[PDB]
Amino acid sequence: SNKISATGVLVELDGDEMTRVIWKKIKETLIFPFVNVPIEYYDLSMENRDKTEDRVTVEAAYAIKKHGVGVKCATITPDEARVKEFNLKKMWRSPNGTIRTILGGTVFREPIICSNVPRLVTTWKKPVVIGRHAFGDQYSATDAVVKEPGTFEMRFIPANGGEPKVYKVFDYKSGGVMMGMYNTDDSIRDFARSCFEFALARKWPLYLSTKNTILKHYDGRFKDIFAEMYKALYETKFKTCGIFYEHRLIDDMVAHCMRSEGGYVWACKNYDGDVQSDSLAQGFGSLGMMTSILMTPDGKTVEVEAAHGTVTRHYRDYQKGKETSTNPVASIFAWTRALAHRARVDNNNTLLEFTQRLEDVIIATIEAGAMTEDLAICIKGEKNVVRADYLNTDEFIDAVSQRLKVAMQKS
Amino acid sequence: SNKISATGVLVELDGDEMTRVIWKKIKETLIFPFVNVPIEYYDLSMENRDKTEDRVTVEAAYAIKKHGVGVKCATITPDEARVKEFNLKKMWRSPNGTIRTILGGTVFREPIICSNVPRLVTTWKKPVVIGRHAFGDQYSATDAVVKEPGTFEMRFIPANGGEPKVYKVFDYKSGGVMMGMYNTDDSIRDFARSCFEFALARKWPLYLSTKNTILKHYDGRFKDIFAEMYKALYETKFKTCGIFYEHRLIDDMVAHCMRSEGGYVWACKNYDGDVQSDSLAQGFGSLGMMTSILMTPDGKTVEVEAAHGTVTRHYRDYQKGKETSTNPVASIFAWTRALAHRARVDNNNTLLEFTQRLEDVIIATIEAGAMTEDLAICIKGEKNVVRADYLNTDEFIDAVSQRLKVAMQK
Ligand SMILES: NC(=O)c1ccc[n+]([C@@H]2O[C@H](COP(=O)([O-])OP(=O)(O)OC[C@H]3O[C@@H](n4cnc5c(N)ncnc54)[C@H](O)[C@@H]3O)[C@@H](O)[C@H]2O)c1
Ligand SMILES: NC(=O)c1ccc[n+]([C@@H]2O[C@H](COP(=O)([O-])OP(=O)(O)OC[C@H]3O[C@@H](n4cnc5c(N)ncnc54)[C@H](O)[C@@H]3O)[C@@H](O)[C@H]2O)c1
Ligand SMILES: [Ca+2]
Ligand SMILES: [Ca+2]
């Protein structure tokens, strides 16, 4: 028992504002002492994404697909406002959207529950993991206003040169609005792969929601694919594990979700993902207890982070010079969740267990009362919380450290 | 003991299976004792709908227009197995379907809340009234699979001969899928009118939710036509009553809805309303604690029912002679909401007083501790619920009957 390590490689992406300052402590205090895995490092501080024309970003994305596991701190996705603050060049796109794209596959959000920390939905006793397809659909579609009377028609035009296929969609007598969207069989099939794979690892059952009732052909295509794919390559594997796949009309699924105790992976389409994920986020409690994880369709490759932002407001009090109480846990979990993936590919039970023992030690700490402002507010309530109801970011980490070292001995 | 009577008229639409049995009970015990109402009765039982050949259903809908208010008992929609059981001549369309067509307007699901009945969401203290926009987004869209590589295009082809405008949406390479969809300015302008009408009438605020961050023109047109109407007709009136309107990203609204004490109307688009309504209504408890209410855009014609069906599972036990404990408040509250409209239109304040007392007393009765089998299940278990904890349908109604008199004190 000293420093244990493992000979694959983590790929660290460094990120900015408050999350950045926590990254730096997490590492020093809770991971580097007891683990020394070799690390290809990158630095996606917006500081540097302007200094490198958003090109450490794309370097780092492929950096992961090579090595198989990544940790990302949260980063600033530029608004137009953001440009004036730091620096000009292009008002850049979101690193998350870039890496997600380069790696293929799908992001899965996971709450982290404690017993003293209540939820808003009384029935939820277990984690509901939403996985979001994040491509096509309403998000890359053409929209338009209609001011004349006229027709809105659609044309499919064969590439080989066959019959344009034409559909009268509607004839406007006054004014209105109009829109078209696509999706591709490849992006869906990859969503499906990534999902089936994700539920299978974590030993949970799997729902996908559509509205094929209404959209017989478009939503059907999704249903029909997961149906196609489940029975080809996974059903047998599911039964062996003892889990399942089912499909639901979205309206069931949200009823089910609400009324069910939890413990499942929920495939959502791109818009159902944006919409539901905010509900869960608020509902489970603090966004500071949630981890995004990015899985590839081959299942063998991953990039995990927190599911919150950089915490700008807190960062401002860091600069003011003031004390702060940011939840480092999603971020700490980020590390453990990753490291645990690197452990299960290296056949490494020393590190694997340390990732369990740290996650257990964090939960047992919160459950014994030592927690942060945000979680104090989950138990008590925003207006009714006071200083000696929580710890600052520093004290939490040094509280979980000391608790950790004692449980490292007794074994 | 004078008994309140009325001046204008009220349309009773009568229903099917268990709720028809409960409907009769409420007029016998809770209504015709305490108030006299000129009623136009149309019976919309499945049998009668068959005999007349859906003729009464239409008959009834026009009546509502003429008079300005409808109360509706739950009615069976004809599907396959229903034609065999009922020996139907022709699988008649849904009656609400038929009715909502003729009247027009927008439905609002309002839930009934009781101190002692916990919700699934801890933060909810007051109602959250979703208004869904029926007219098709997705629900009137065209969709088809792409097999060949090729190109999805869109044309707007002006009816005045002018030069069309194309839009290349996508070039497929493998196969995929394509959808095109629409909405009218007028359909949205009537969704709006109705929501503003409703929110003012209730004295609640109104959130409109859309995704105009992405659908800048499409979901834009919703945001726009609302605020056009807001600060032309309604902003003076809402501020007087101490309410407001505001737009929000659909992302806010679900998160707000969750964090929020509540007490507002939420208008949302067809799809956004369909999906939420079914989690929302699960969160609040039994289905017997919610009312539906169509309100046309002027705000003068209205038609109100329970937000639940005919509860057939229990109608089989009523047939067999076993005790039943269907919950009646939704059904009752359809009567009180409908009369409450009838009353507000007749500037008729003695009836308005009744509609209030009955609503308040029904809550009192449950709050106190007499309830139906669902509400004991909410409070106590599913297990650990014994017979002393719930009244049967009849003996519950008759339990508020008493307490109504006890508070028939003005
Ligand atoms: N990489 C990512 O996961 C990600 C996701 C969304 C937004 N962002 C970015 O984050 C920045 C800030 O945006 P935001 O307003 O959504 O902020 P945020 O998501 O960091 O936090 C939202 C609010 O919730 C609270 N909160 C969230 N996480 C917390 C934690 N761990 N501990 C304590 N409190 C917490 C904060 O008080 C904050 O005001 C933006 O520049 C945006 O581009 C990043
Ligand atoms: N007129 C309408 O607005 C309307 C709406 C929905 C369904 N229906 C009709 O009713 C029939 C059956 O519908 P369904 O069974 O799908 O839904 P339902 O509302 O009849 O009942 C479904 C379940 O909900 C429960 N439920 C509903 N109201 C209840 C109450 N007051 N107390 C206790 N439990 C209650 C029942 O226990 C039942 O198991 C169908 O033939 C349909 O056409 C009519
Ligand atoms: Ca969102
Ligand atoms: Ca629904």
Side-chain angles (χ1 to χ4, degrees):
Chain A
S1 304
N2 37 358
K3 315 92 206 174
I4 69 102
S5 21
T7 40
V9 294
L10 250 190
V11 181
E12 184 170 334
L13 284 61
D14 211 320
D16 51 0
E17 296 183 327
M18 186 76 249
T19 47
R20 193 184 176 89
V21 182
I22 278 144
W23 211 249
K24 184 249 194 315
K25 297 186 192 186
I26 291 326
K27 283 197 284 167
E28 263 131 87
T29 327
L30 308 194
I31 78 98
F32 267 130
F34 323 107
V35 169
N36 346 248
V37 317
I39 321 194
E40 211 171 295
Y41 171 104
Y42 291 72
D43 190 333
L44 278 73
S45 52
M46 185 123 259
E47 195 73 63
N48 200 289
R49 280 174 282 144
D50 194 280
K51 256 298 306 318
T52 211
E53 287 251 317
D54 209 277
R55 196 250 192 76
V56 149
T57 323
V58 41
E59 262 164 16
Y62 288 107
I64 297 155
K65 212 218 301 300
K66 194 249 189 56
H67 296 303
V69 176
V71 254
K72 203 192 158 273
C73 173
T75 56
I76 310 163
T77 285
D79 169 30
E80 211 172 305
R82 280 297 192 177
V83 194
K84 279 95 213 175
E85 177 178 351
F86 248 107
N87 272 300
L88 209 74
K89 325 196 184 181
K90 279 167 202 90
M91 187 221 63
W92 314 109
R93 242 148 294 184
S94 183
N96 288 352
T98 282
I99 311 139
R100 173 164 39 254
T101 306
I102 283 151
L103 275 312
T106 297
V107 191
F108 301 95
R109 290 172 122 60
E110 304 183 70
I112 327 156
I113 311 171
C114 330
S115 24
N116 53 324
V117 64
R119 281 109 285 169
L120 300 186
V121 193
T122 73
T123 59
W124 299 349
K125 276 291 225 318
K126 255 133 68 119
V128 172
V129 174
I130 280 177
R132 175 169 165 176
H133 178 209
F135 170 91
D137 300 327
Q138 29 279 119
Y139 293 86
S140 47
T142 319
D143 74 326
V145 241
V146 177
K147 313 257 189 40
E148 296 231 64
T151 295
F152 164 48
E153 73 159 39
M154 282 163 55
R155 279 168 81 246
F156 178 57
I157 298 155
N160 73 20
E163 267 152 19
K165 217 160 304 211
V166 13
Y167 314 74
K168 18 55 221 192
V169 192
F170 185 81
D171 290 301
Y172 302 87
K173 309 299 186 224
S174 123
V177 100
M178 56 155 92
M179 190 210 84
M181 40 192 151
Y182 58 100
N183 214 294
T184 75
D185 295 334
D186 256 74
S187 202
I188 296 168
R189 217 179 267 93
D190 279 344
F191 175 46
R193 259 178 216 86
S194 280
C195 277
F196 282 115
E197 288 286 312
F198 186 82
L200 178 54
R202 234 154 263 239
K203 293 152 122 34
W204 264 316
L206 200 243
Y207 304 89
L208 155 68
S209 51
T210 93
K211 196 81 173 149
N212 57 323
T213 308
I214 297 293
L215 275 355
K216 273 94 163 294
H217 295 84
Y218 193 115
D219 284 12
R221 200 79 204 98
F222 286 82
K223 190 211 196 286
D224 279 34
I225 281 169
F226 285 72
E228 279 166 42
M229 183 171 275
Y230 190 49
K231 304 197 281 263
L233 317 113
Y234 298 97
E235 181 173 25
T236 342
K237 311 188 74 198
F238 271 52
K239 285 182 121 97
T240 320
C241 246
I243 45 183
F244 63 113
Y245 163 74
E246 198 168 310
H247 152 267
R248 305 294 200 76
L249 266 40
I250 187 68
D251 356 14
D252 285 340
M253 207 45 210
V254 296
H256 174 80
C257 172
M258 192 69 143
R259 115 179 72 72
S260 171
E261 54 156 327
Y264 50 80
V265 201
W266 172 11
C268 288
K269 309 177 30 175
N270 185 186
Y271 180 76
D272 290 337
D274 204 351
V275 173
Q276 297 305 326
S277 294
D278 290 51
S279 209
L280 277 242
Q282 194 64 273
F284 261 90
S286 157
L287 224 198
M289 308 281 263
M290 196 146 273
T291 49
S292 289
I293 184 164
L294 179 59
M295 177 141 278
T296 65
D298 56 283
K300 220 100 303 199
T301 298
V302 133
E303 186 246 25
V304 47
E305 43 153 15
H308 52 80
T310 67
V311 201
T312 312
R313 271 210 310 110
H314 282 241
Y315 186 46
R316 301 318 194 195
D317 302 348
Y318 187 61
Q319 295 162 133
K320 299 339 149 212
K322 295 175 184 183
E323 189 188 44
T324 33
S325 175
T326 300
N327 208 350
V329 66
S331 338
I332 298 164
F333 265 68
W335 282 84
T336 61
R337 218 84 104 181
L339 289 161
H341 188 101
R342 181 81 289 147
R344 253 174 302 156
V345 175
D346 300 27
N347 290 217
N348 184 187
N349 252 110
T350 324
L351 181 71
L352 182 49
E353 284 178 354
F354 171 72
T355 68
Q356 194 66 20
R357 212 45 78 220
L358 188 55
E359 288 175 0
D360 292 15
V361 157
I362 298 160
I363 295 289
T365 298
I366 283 156
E367 290 167 6
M371 69 190 69
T372 28
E373 191 177 45
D374 61 314
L375 303 187
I377 94 145
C378 267
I379 347 284
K380 301 194 197 302
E382 209 291 325
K383 180 53 186 161
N384 223 77
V385 159
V386 286
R387 186 43 243 238
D389 296 304
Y390 55 95
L391 314 184
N392 57 34
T393 319
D394 293 315
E395 283 156 339
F396 190 74
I397 282 165
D398 302 329
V400 301
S401 146
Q402 229 117 50
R403 188 75 56 105
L404 174 69
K405 275 151 102 213
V406 12
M408 295 280 75
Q409 189 270 98
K410 309 188 104 187
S411 310
Chain B
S1 334
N2 275 313
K3 308 303 89 167
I4 296 160
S5 261
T7 142
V9 318
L10 177 270
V11 190
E12 184 187 337
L13 278 57
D14 190 282
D16 280 309
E17 311 193 303
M18 193 52 208
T19 63
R20 188 202 243 289
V21 178
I22 303 151
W23 196 257
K24 195 200 177 66
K25 226 306 199 203
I26 288 147
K27 298 184 284 152
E28 227 106 65
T29 295
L30 297 186
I31 260 90
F32 297 145
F34 307 94
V35 40
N36 317 121
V37 185
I39 292 162
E40 212 162 302
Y41 181 82
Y42 296 85
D43 180 18
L44 273 57
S45 52
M46 178 47 78
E47 291 79 333
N48 193 58
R49 229 132 26 100
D50 201 76
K51 196 221 158 140
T52 27
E53 300 183 323
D54 227 59
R55 187 76 283 107
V56 292
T57 312
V58 172
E59 270 177 30
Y62 284 102
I64 282 154
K65 185 175 290 165
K66 182 136 179 263
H67 300 316
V69 180
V71 220
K72 204 180 159 307
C73 190
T75 34
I76 295 156
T77 294
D79 73 15
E80 189 53 70
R82 289 292 200 177
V83 303
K84 283 122 178 302
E85 185 212 335
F86 278 89
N87 202 310
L88 289 174
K89 299 188 106 302
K90 178 165 171 300
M91 183 206 277
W92 318 95
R93 305 184 297 85
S94 140
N96 318 87
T98 315
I99 274 155
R100 300 197 48 261
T101 284
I102 292 169
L103 278 340
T106 314
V107 200
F108 291 96
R109 325 199 107 64
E110 315 183 63
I112 298 155
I113 282 171
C114 302
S115 168
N116 62 334
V117 84
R119 321 88 230 259
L120 286 191
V121 187
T122 84
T123 33
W124 296 356
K125 331 231 74 59
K126 304 148 162 216
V128 185
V129 184
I130 294 184
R132 212 235 263 199
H133 174 47
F135 196 83
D137 288 308
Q138 25 256 157
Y139 292 88
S140 70
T142 322
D143 67 326
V145 341
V146 159
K147 319 277 195 93
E148 317 195 320
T151 300
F152 174 34
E153 195 176 81
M154 310 201 296
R155 342 177 128 278
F156 180 63
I157 299 168
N160 69 346
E163 189 83 341
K165 54 199 83 169
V166 305
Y167 304 96
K168 113 159 70 63
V169 187
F170 199 68
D171 293 336
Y172 299 84
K173 309 203 303 284
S174 80
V177 136
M178 64 166 77
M179 169 157 54
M181 72 178 224
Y182 72 89
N183 230 305
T184 114
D185 270 359
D186 290 29
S187 182
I188 300 171
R189 228 170 281 103
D190 294 322
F191 179 51
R193 249 171 315 259
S194 294
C195 302
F196 291 118
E197 279 305 326
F198 184 82
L200 188 56
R202 264 49 181 156
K203 324 264 159 267
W204 277 317
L206 216 177
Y207 297 85
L208 170 66
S209 68
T210 88
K211 199 75 158 132
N212 66 317
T213 36
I214 309 308
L215 270 57
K216 288 183 196 175
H217 306 276
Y218 201 111
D219 290 34
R221 193 98 221 86
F222 281 71
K223 172 151 183 272
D224 283 346
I225 294 173
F226 267 71
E228 270 174 358
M229 190 166 299
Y230 179 53
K231 54 187 170 125
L233 321 189
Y234 296 101
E235 175 163 62
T236 274
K237 308 235 260 284
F238 273 48
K239 225 189 194 169
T240 316
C241 298
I243 57 160
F244 56 85
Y245 157 86
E246 87 181 24
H247 179 268
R248 286 196 189 179
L249 269 10
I250 179 73
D251 314 300
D252 259 35
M253 270 307 285
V254 297
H256 173 79
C257 185
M258 202 95 218
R259 191 184 19 79
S260 173
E261 146 168 79
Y264 54 80
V265 174
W266 176 12
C268 47
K269 273 122 68 72
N270 217 340
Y271 184 83
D272 284 306
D274 194 11
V275 183
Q276 297 309 111
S277 286
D278 252 55
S279 113
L280 193 283
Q282 202 70 191
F284 274 103
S286 170
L287 246 67
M289 301 302 292
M290 184 171 272
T291 76
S292 225
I293 161 156
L294 188 156
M295 174 154 234
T296 66
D298 46 311
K300 312 181 165 80
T301 317
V302 146
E303 180 252 79
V304 11
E305 90 210 304
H308 67 67
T310 64
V311 48
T312 308
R313 310 273 175 71
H314 297 171
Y315 180 67
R316 305 322 192 189
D317 291 37
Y318 160 94
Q319 286 174 338
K320 276 144 212 191
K322 307 106 172 293
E323 202 178 317
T324 203
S325 178
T326 317
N327 178 351
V329 335
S331 291
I332 292 160
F333 271 64
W335 277 94
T336 53
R337 261 68 130 120
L339 287 170
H341 192 96
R342 174 71 284 143
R344 228 163 321 118
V345 189
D346 298 4
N347 295 159
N348 168 356
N349 214 320
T350 64
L351 189 37
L352 199 40
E353 278 242 78
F354 177 71
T355 63
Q356 298 159 357
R357 251 110 89 184
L358 188 34
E359 282 189 13
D360 292 294
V361 170
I362 290 155
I363 302 304
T365 298
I366 289 145
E367 291 210 322
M371 59 196 90
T372 32
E373 208 199 325
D374 39 339
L375 309 183
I377 282 169
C378 291
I379 302 169
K380 291 239 296 145
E382 255 294 15
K383 196 185 305 310
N384 29 93
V385 171
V386 322
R387 178 69 228 292
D389 311 334
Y390 61 95
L391 291 279
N392 108 255
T393 317
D394 283 302
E395 71 183 320
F396 172 90
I397 289 170
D398 254 286
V400 328
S401 199
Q402 295 288 59
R403 286 163 130 282
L404 184 47
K405 278 157 176 188
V406 101
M408 285 264 83
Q409 311 289 327
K410 169 69 216 109

